[PDB]
Design an enzyme around this catalytic site. Structure first.
Site, PDB file in Angstrom:
ATOM      1  N   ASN A 146       4.647   8.542  10.504  1.00  0.00           N
ATOM      2  CA  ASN A 146       3.585   9.234   9.808  1.00  0.00           C
ATOM      3  C   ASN A 146       3.234  10.540  10.505  1.00  0.00           C
ATOM      4  OD1 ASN A 146       3.222   8.025   7.341  1.00  0.00           O
ATOM      5  ND2 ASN A 146       1.583   6.692   8.020  1.00  0.00           N
ATOM      6  N   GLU A 188      28.308   5.242  -0.281  1.00  0.00           N
ATOM      7  CA  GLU A 188      28.942   6.197   0.622  1.00  0.00           C
ATOM      8  C   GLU A 188      28.288   6.156   2.007  1.00  0.00           C
ATOM      9  OE1 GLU A 188      31.660   8.040   0.194  1.00  0.00           O
ATOM     10  OE2 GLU A 188      31.999   7.347  -1.849  1.00  0.00           O
ATOM     11  N   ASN A 232       3.302  12.491   0.731  1.00  0.00           N
ATOM     12  CA  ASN A 232       4.057  11.813  -0.308  1.00  0.00           C
ATOM     13  C   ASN A 232       4.994  12.786  -1.025  1.00  0.00           C
ATOM     14  OD1 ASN A 232       2.554   9.774   0.694  1.00  0.00           O
ATOM     15  ND2 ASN A 232       1.598   9.144  -1.223  1.00  0.00           N
ATOM     16  N   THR A 274       1.270  -7.128   3.065  1.00  0.00           N
ATOM     17  CA  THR A 274       2.160  -7.462   1.970  1.00  0.00           C
ATOM     18  C   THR A 274       3.431  -6.624   2.052  1.00  0.00           C
ATOM     19  OG1 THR A 274       2.383  -7.592  -0.424  1.00  0.00           O
ATOM     20  CG2 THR A 274       0.831  -5.960   0.443  1.00  0.00           C
ATOM     21  N   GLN A 306       0.837  -1.175   0.000  1.00  0.00           N
ATOM     22  CA  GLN A 306       0.000   0.000   0.000  1.00  0.00           C
ATOM     23  C   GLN A 306       0.888   1.246   0.000  1.00  0.00           C
ATOM     24  OE1 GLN A 306      -2.031   0.376   3.806  1.00  0.00           O
ATOM     25  NE2 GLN A 306      -1.833   2.605   3.376  1.00  0.00           N
TER      26      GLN A 306
END
EC number: 3.6.5.-
Lengths: 428, 426, 22, 201, 201, 201, 22
Positions: free
Chosen positions: A197, A245, A219, A136, A11
């Protein structure tokens, strides 16, 4: 020639994958179609006459979030098989996503991955985006990393884990998912970055003064991090920092690869034309505990190592004049065996603004990634919330009856307990 | 893709189930005749979940009508949106179970089961891939409770991994028409605690309290009551049919709301709900929804949740809304009422966001709570069961059909231990 | 008697075919 | 003589071109009757087409765009179902790019004026008026027919309704997208449009 | 072909520009039909805009100012609420410099002439007359409507009345002011205006 | 945009100046829109001002002087009270020196011509006729209203009749003289008038 | 019919952006 493969699972990975690829395409000047009508080579392919196809895979077990990708604007940009779907979900269940439902979707995954990663060697590695709290995202997420580890050994496997918040979870089976993943995220992942979140939620509510963000505003801000992350990989740099790095510079020992994030500045159009965003100003705001992206106060920890990526009209001189101030500040402190504790990066091309977004067109920016001892609280908080549930066997019948065995929780508990013993031993 | 097979049992299930197809059809823009109006993608993109093409333009629901007497489904055929159902999906009975759970289950259920189950075999398997089933019935009735439940017992054995949720309307607390109520209710529960997956309880008296105290309808008919139950049914399956910011199928709900496999009896509310007089005066927002929702007045069962503890809850939101406002209100609720949430689990609630609201409302919410206040439901059936099982009242009806007296005692213990189970977490 | 439907999603409102980068 | 021989538009083309060939031959080693290569066709006469404002545009305006005929009937459930996808496809393909790529002509199979008006009001693309003889002529030419009542001259029906056929300058068909056809791949037929190789030159 | 393909100004623009492209092509490997970049239109004719004294100003008066349309209705409570804040913002923003910054055009969703003049008496910025078809053409161009009365072609309502739309030279939707939108900053959204980058050039 | 932005006279100013600027830019880093400093208007045309015994006086005769507009009413008792003080002040101040320093231009808020001539028969300074639209555009410019009847664009009523406003070259108010204002000093606010600074160039 | 409200604040009356001295 020079590549890095993106893997989105779950998701959260798909949704944050969407906002990532919008910005990557926009700043490289390629259309919805894919034809701009060699700085792009790291992200995109060449498919005949000036057509660019992204080097990414979308994985989900349910079709309804990959349907909407195949249906919207960028349906001509992604190769159809680079979005892999099942017919039924994993349903917030690690057990389902690993043993029951997951086995017949990874074979299609590794086919697409192999064909998209064999065109040139000198592959930097794999970016992975998963929701740890998900089914998932967690279940399958271990499994494709397991087979990746067997195949491509030498090569970076980074991760951007969407971690459960301290106070807001919106899932009650989620302490089981988080602990079970963290055990196997420990063994076969090179770098883990935690994007909590509600850390980003209150960042928006204070800095941008936005009352009503959605996931898409979240997002876009994560997309600005990945862009500033890999700016040196794509573009010209005064002192470029690659992805190999990081692992050498931020990971002292095998077990410790859990790092935080802070991006500054993020100010709206209404308070950006007031601000002279000097290098000192933006680096002060980077180290502020109210700008961290994990909701974990570093005042009850020690900075074991720290990485700073500058982007824009940034001179090397003002970086040194502004990092020396941080070393002399007393509120922020460093572990005794780390007298020097900084890695710097300067990239030329300033951050790209997405139209109809909520950020502002700015001259310079900082992305900071730090390894801390303050990480001890984020698993010590799951320590409590797991022994609360597992004491009287809440939700355990789901996991047992679909393929797992009793005692995988006990093994997950021991490894998490040994991890807390490990961070406390380092901090001495 | 995924389909839900709908199964309607009894007089209640047909009259309730008629309106469920009326609201889904309106949501997906389906004519009474069967066609489609409204040239938008959103409806037909996920239409496979409920409907089925006929290659005359038209759609048939995935519905299995089911009753033991021919009268009640004559009414649903003669009505509007009654031409929508395929007439072979009806299954008729001539005899009928006269509020007798035994002869619903054992005698006159056993010859119709081979017919109705054939219709289910043909229709469920007929897609690419089935998601599960849903059953609507009364546990006070005869063919809703006796033969409805026997369908559930057999379909569960054949299809073990498919979801199986129900919308069961229990016995009322106060007034008890069909006097053999606790015999039907108790014998149904122990068959519906083993062979069912999610149960959502509705009381008639809870519905009548909502009408008379809040909606302020003078004459609330079964049309108006069934309109509201249908709006609850559509709420719990928004994700299956429309996209959202946080998707939530039916199985996703269960694994959160069910901590232990015995206890899966849920409560339902729906917000917003105001009269037509106060429709235009009331400010609609996320905080206004979430405080209408957390109210015994709003709940669709006659069990005050403040007498117990919300073991786990969930809200399935619909509409254009901000995640943070959702996130604050679900946290605000736990911070102020700390005594109504069980302690050994933090953040007892799940949030879900579906984008497309119900038509006419800009924002709404349906509600699912797993409480130990539903203990006071089963006790009030348990004493009523043992009150007339003491005297062996109306037992010759039940024991003349094929049952033994042992089944009554098992139904007692299998319900009293469930009462004792809700004690253990309180 | 059915009024038509006046909703368009979060998706269609914001993921549109954007004009070319400057 | 594409795509059939026995079409009214082909006999019209043969007539005018035979006439003009005879005239220039009379003025002048001319192949009578002229070659179908030498034939030049005016497809939509000067005032057949009209946009959504009901003003005429010449045929020459359509240069550089993949022009697709769209045979539609109003009352047909199938055409009513196809219309939103086609709107969306027109949307996306002509909005996301540098030049206009595709363009649609609407040809009615309805029976009367108010039906034609009501159906055409939903459509932003160009349309041919119902009473015009060109509508019947085009139906015969492409052998689109709702059900067989028209005497086809030994041929059959290429398609039913709805249909989209992309066309060229000379009046041929370049691609016949399978909505309800041999392939029956409705609403996924749109994705097979080769607007690169089909141009109204 | 911005913000939409199917809008009246864009169809007039396409017709006119490629009409001129065929004229100069006949007069002379110039690309037909001309690119959205190559096109130029006159948006407001000679007689459209009028000030407080009902004296006409041409379009070229708007050059170098951030111009914004204001779709307003006389009797709508939301418009009645939004008007004083918009007027105060106009006041302060243009007063606070030695240069003109922003300008408002009034586009009327109002009922009739009398009410239009009564409402137009309250505004100190420019306006377009209601009987002029340019009002309806602009409404369908920017997809503002009070409810689904005029057909839109698979699109949605962008917004409702009241709305402020920052425009460009060529009908570019420069930015949406979120008054009644996905964001709902009633009377607060005016501060979002980026007058710097959106110049009527 | 001084002292208001929503003035009809400021709109007229913007029109003229920006028209001139566009034609100059067409003919030739010239600023569009023009700066407020660079904008120039003709305020009183040649036929505006009329002196004693009705002879036309141009704008040229107002140069190098302190000029105040007298917004006055005929039947207003406050106006009838204010008039003799201003008459004595004007007389004494102009006698007191080599130069005539101050001038008054009278703007009438009377009902009709009879009232206008009856009131103006007293006054020796200049007066603008009632029919000329100047007498209302100046009124709207300097925000004068007897009664809230003018459509007023979120203004405050800056003053009530009577009032005197010292005007600059470019229409800016040099200073407000507070008769019925924040200071409320009737018939003695005259003495606050400075004439060194407030010169009509 | 009506008589209109006419009053505004002292702040907006006498605190406005005055043009700068030469």
């Amino acid at each position: 020639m020079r590549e890095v493969i993106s893997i989105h699972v779950g998701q959260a990975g798909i949704q944050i994958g969407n906002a990532c690829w919008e910005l990557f395409c926009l700043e490289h000047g390629i259309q919805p179609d894919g034809q701009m009508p060699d700085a792009f080579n790291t992200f995109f392919s060449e498919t005949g006459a000036g057509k660019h196809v992204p080097r990414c895979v979308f994985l989900d077990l349910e079709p309804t979030v990959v349907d909407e990708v195949r249906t919207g604007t960028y349906r001509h940009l992604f190769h159809p098989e680079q979005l892999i779907s099942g017919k039924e979900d994993a349903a917030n269940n690690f057990a389902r996503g690993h043993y029951t439902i997951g086995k017949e979707i990874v074979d299609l995954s590794l086919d697409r991955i192999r064909k998209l990663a064999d065109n040139c060697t000198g592959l930097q590695g794999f970016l992975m985006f998963n929701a740890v709290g998900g089914g998932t995202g967690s279940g399958l997420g271990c499994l494709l990393l397991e087979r990746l580890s067997v195949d491509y050994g030498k090569k970076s496997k980074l991760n951007f884990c969407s971690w459960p918040s301290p106070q807001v979870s919106t899932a009650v089976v989620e302490p089981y998912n988080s602990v079970l993943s963290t055990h196997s995220l420990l063994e076969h992942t090179d770098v883990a970055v935690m994007l909590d979140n509600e850390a980003i939620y209150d960042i928006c509510r204070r800095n941008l003064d936005i009352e009503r963000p959605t996931y898409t505003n979240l997002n876009r801000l994560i997309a600005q991090v990945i862009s500033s992350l890999t700016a040196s990989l794509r573009f010209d740099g005064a002192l470029n920092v690659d992805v190999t790095e990081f692992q050498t510079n931020l990971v002292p020992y095998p077990r410790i690869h859990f790092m935080l994030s802070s991006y500054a500045p993020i100010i709206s159009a209404e308070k950006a034309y007031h601000e002279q965003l000097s290098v000192a100003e933006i680096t002060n705001s980077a180290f502020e505990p109210a700008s961290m992206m994990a909701k974990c106060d570093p005042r009850h920890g020690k900075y074991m190592a720290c990485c700073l990526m500058y982007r824009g009209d940034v001179v090397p001189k003002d970086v040194n004049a502004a990092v020396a101030t941080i070393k002399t500040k007393r509120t922020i402190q460093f572990v005794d065996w780390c007298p020097t504790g900084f890695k710097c990066g300067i990239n030329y091309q300033p951050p790209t603004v997405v139209p109809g977004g909520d950020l502002a067109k700015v001259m310079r920016a900082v992305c900071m990634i730090s390894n801390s001892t303050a990480i001890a609280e984020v698993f010590s908080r799951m320590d409590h919330k797991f022994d609360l549930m597992y004491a009287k066997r809440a939700f355990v019948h789901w996991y047992v009856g679909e393929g797992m065995e009793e005692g995988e929780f006990s093994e997950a508990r021991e490894d998490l307990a040994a991890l807390e013993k490990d961070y406390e031993e380092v901090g001495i | 893709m995924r389909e839900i097979v709908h199964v309607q049992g009894g007089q209640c299930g047909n009259q309730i189930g008629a309106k469920f197809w009326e609201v889904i059809s309106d949501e997906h823009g389906i004519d009474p005749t069967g066609t489609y109006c409204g040239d938008s993608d959103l409806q037909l993109e996920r239409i496979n979940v409920f409907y089925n093409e006929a290659t005359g333009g038209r759609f048939v629901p995935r519905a299995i009508l089911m009753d033991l007497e021919p009268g009640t489904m004559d009414s649903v055929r003669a009505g509007p949106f009654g031409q929508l159902f395929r007439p072979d999906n009806f299954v008729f009975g001539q005899t009928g179970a006269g509020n007798n759970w035994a002869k619903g289950h054992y005698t006159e259920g056993a010859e119709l089961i081979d017919s109705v189950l054939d219709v289910v075999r043909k229709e469920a398997e007929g897609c690419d891939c089935l998601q599960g089933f849903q059953i609507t019935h009364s546990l006070g009735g005869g063919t809703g409770s006796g033969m409805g439940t026997l369908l559930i017992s057999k379909v569960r054995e054949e299809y073990p991994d498919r979801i199986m949720e129900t919308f069961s309307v229990f016995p009322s607390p106060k007034v008890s028409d069909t006097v053999v109520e606790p015999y039907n209710a108790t014998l149904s529960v122990h068959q519906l605690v083993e062979n069912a997956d999610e149960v959502q309880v509705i009381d008639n008296e809870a519905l009548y309290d909502i009408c008379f105290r809040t909606l302020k309808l003078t004459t609330p008919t079964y049309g108006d009551l069934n309109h509201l139950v249908s709006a609850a049914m559509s709420g719990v399956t928004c994700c299956l049919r429309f996209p959202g910011q946080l998707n939530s199928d039916l199985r996703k709900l269960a694994v959160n709301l069910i901590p232990f496999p015995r206890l899966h009896f849920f409560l339902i509310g729906f917000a917003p709900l105001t009269s037509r007089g106060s429709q235009q005066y009331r400010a609609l927002s996320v905080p206004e929804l979430t405080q209408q929702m957390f109210d015994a007045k709003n709940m669709m069962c006659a069990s005050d949740p403040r007498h117990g503890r919300y073991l786990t809850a969930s809200a399935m939101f619909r509409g254009r809304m901000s995640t943070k406002e959702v996130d604050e209100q679900m946290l605000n609720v736990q911070n102020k009422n700390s005594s109504y949430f069980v302690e050994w689990i933090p953040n007892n609630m799940k949030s879900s966001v579906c984008d497309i609201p119900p038509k006419g409302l800009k924002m709404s919410v349906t509600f699912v709570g797993n409480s130990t206040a539903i203990q006071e439901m089963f006790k009030r059936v348990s004493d009523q069961f043992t009150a007339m099982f003491r005297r062996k009242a109306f037992l010759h009806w039940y024991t003349g059909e094929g049952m033994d007296e042992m089944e009554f005692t098992e139904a007692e213990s299998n319900m009293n231990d469930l009462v004792s189970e809700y004690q253990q977490y309180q | 008697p059915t009024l038509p439907f006046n909703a368009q999603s979060c998706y269609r409102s914001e993921y549109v075919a954007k004009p070319l980068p400057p | 003589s594409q795509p059939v021989f026995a079409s009214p538009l082909n006999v019209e083309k043969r007539r005018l071109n035979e006439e003009r060939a005879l005239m220039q031959a009379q003025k002048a080693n001319i192949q009578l009757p002229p070659n179908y290569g030498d034939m030049d066709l005016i497809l939509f006469p000067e005032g057949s087409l009209k946009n959504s404002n009901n003003t005429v545009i010449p045929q020459s305006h359509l240069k550089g765009k993949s022009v697709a005929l769209y045979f539609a009937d109003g009352a047909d459930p199938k055409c009513a179902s196809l219309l939103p996808f086609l709107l969306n496809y027109y949307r996306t393909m002509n909005e996301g790019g540098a030049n206009q790529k595709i363009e649609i002509i609407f040809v009615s199979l309805d029976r009367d004026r108010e039906a034609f008006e009501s159906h055409r009001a939903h459509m932003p693309w160009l349309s041919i008026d119902l009473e015009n003889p060109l509508t019947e002529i085009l139906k015969r030419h492409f052998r689109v027919m709702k059900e067989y009542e028209v005497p086809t001259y030994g041929y059959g029906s290429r398609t039913g309704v709805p249909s989209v056929i992309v066309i060229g300058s000379d009046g041929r068909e370049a691609q016949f997208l399978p909505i309800c056809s041999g392939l029956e791949e409705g609403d996924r037929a749109l994705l097979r449009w080769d607007w690169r190789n089909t141009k109204f030159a």
